[PDB]
DNA sequence: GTTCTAGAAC
DNA sequence: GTTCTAGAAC
C-alpha cells in the first residue's frame, strides 16, 4: 500500500478532521482518540510534524510544555465536574507517527481496551509521564528510553489502584468496576 | 494502531 | 464447549 494511506500515518488524517477536533490554537490540536481506552481519552498533537520523541530536541521544549498545559485545560473544560483522576504522557515506543500526548482518565472503562498490551502500555514504565519527558528534554536535551520496553507489555495484569493481580483482561475489566 | 480468528487455555 | 489470547495482514 501507499505511505500516506498506511495505518501508521492515520493521526495525520484525524488531526485535520473537524469532527474529531475538540480544541485548536496556533500551536496544537486536540482530538478524541479514535479507540479510547477510557471514558475520556484525547490526543494533543502539534501542528508541526515531529515523527516521535526520538526527533525531539530542546527547540521543542516550549511546545511540549504547551501541549501539557492544553491537556490540563481540556480536562477542566470537558471533564471538570467528573473529578476523575487523569494521567498525561507518551508511550515509550509509539505505533502511530506524529508526536502525540495521551490525556486519559484512570477509569480505563472502555470496550476498546481489549488486550494486555493496551493495559501495560498505560500502566507500566512504558507510559512516560508528560512531566518526566519535559524535564528530560530540558536537562538532557533529548528523550532516551531504557532497553526492555517491549517486555513490559508482557507483564502480568495488575490493578493500578490496589495492585491486585488479575489472570485475564475480562477479569481485570470486571475488577476495575470496583474502583469507580 | 486495528481486525480477524486459530487454537491454546480454561 | 466456551473463553481467551496472540500472530498475520501481500
Ligand atoms: N486513525 C486514528 N485516529 C485517531 N487516533 C488513533 C487512530 N489510530 C489509532 N489511534 C489512537 O492513537 C494511539 C496510538 O498509540 P501510540 O502510537 O502507542 O501512542 C492509541 O490511543 C490509538 O487508539
Ligand atoms: Zn484494584
Numbering used by the authors: 161 to 340
The study reports:
L248M: The dominant L248M APTX mutant was identified in AOA1 patients with severe clinical phenotype presenting early disease onset and a progressive ataxic syndrome with cerebellar atrophy, mental retardation, and epilepsy (Castellotti et al, 2011). This substitution is conservative and slightly stabilizing in the presence of AMP, yet unexpectedly has a ~7‐fold impact on APTX deadenylation at 37°C. Intriguingly, the crystal structure of L248M shows limited overall conformational perturbation of the DNA bound protein, with structural changes limited to minor shifts in neighboring His228. However, Leu248 maps to strand β4, is found in the protein hydrophobic core, and flanks regions of the protein undergoing conformational changes between the catalytic domain closed and opened states. These conformational changes extend from α1 to residues surrounding the active site and Leu248 also participates in this network. Thus, we hypothesized that L248M might impact solution conformational states of the protein. Consistent with this hypothesis, and in stark contrast to the DNA bound X‐ray structure of the L248M protein, apo L248M displayed significant global conformational perturbations in 1H‐15N HSQC spectra of unliganded protein compared to WT. Given the distance from the catalytic center (> 10 Å), we assert that L248M substitution impacts active site assembly allosterically, possibly through a network of interactions within the protein core that are influenced by this substitution. NMR results show the L248M mutation impacts a network of surrounding secondary structure, rendering the domain “arthritic”, such that DNA binding‐induced conformational changes are impaired. The stabilizing effect of L248M and its allosteric impact on catalytic domain conformations suggest that this mutation influences active site assembly and disassembly.
The APTX RNA‐DNA deadenylase protects genome integrity and corrects abortive DNA ligation arising during ribonucleotide excision repair and base excision DNA repair, and APTX human mutations cause the neurodegenerative disorder ataxia with oculomotor ataxia 1 (AOA1). The aprataxin (APTX) RNA/DNA polynucleotide deadenylase directly reverses 5′‐AMP damage (Ahel et al, 2006; Harris et al, 2009; Reynolds et al, 2009; Tumbale et al, 2011, 2014) and associates with DNA repair scaffolds XRCC1 (Cherry et al, 2015) and XRCC4. Environmental and metabolic sources of DNA damage prompt “abortive ligation”, the failure of ligase to complete step 3, and generation of 5′‐adenylated (5′‐AMP) DNA strand breaks (Ahel et al, 2006; Andres et al, 2015; Schellenberg et al, 2015). AOA1 mutations map to the APTX catalytic domain (Barbot et al, 2001; Moreira et al, 2001; Shimazaki et al, 2002; Le Ber et al, 2003; Tranchant et al, 2003; Criscuolo et al, 2004, 2005; Ito et al, 2005; Mosesso et al, 2005; Baba et al, 2007; Yokoseki et al, 2011) and cause variable age of disease onset.
